[PDB]
Amino acid sequence: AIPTNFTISVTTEILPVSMTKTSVDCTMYICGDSTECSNLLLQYGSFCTQ
C-alpha cells in the first residue's frame, strides 16, 4: 500500500518549564513579628535556614 498524496499537519505540544519562585520568611508565618516566639524558635536551630 503506497501513498500518492500527503498532508502537512501542525500539532501543539505544551510543556511546563518553570514555577513561581516562592520564598518564605519563617518568623512571620510561624510567630508574626513576636520576639518571644522567635526566641523560643531559636531553640529549634537550623530548620528555617534549611
Place this chain on the structure above:
Amino acid sequence: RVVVLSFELLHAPATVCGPKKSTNLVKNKCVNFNFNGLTGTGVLTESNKK
C-alpha cells in the same frame, strides 16, 4: 465559702476588664498594642468594616 468566676476570653465585646489605664493611639507606626486584653504588635490604620 467558695466562688467560681466563669468567663470566656477574647471572643465577644468586653464590658468587664482589669484595672490597667488606657493610652493614646498612634497610627501608621508599628507599636505593641492591647485592645480589650487582645495584645499584639503591628501598625494600626483606619478601615471600613460593618
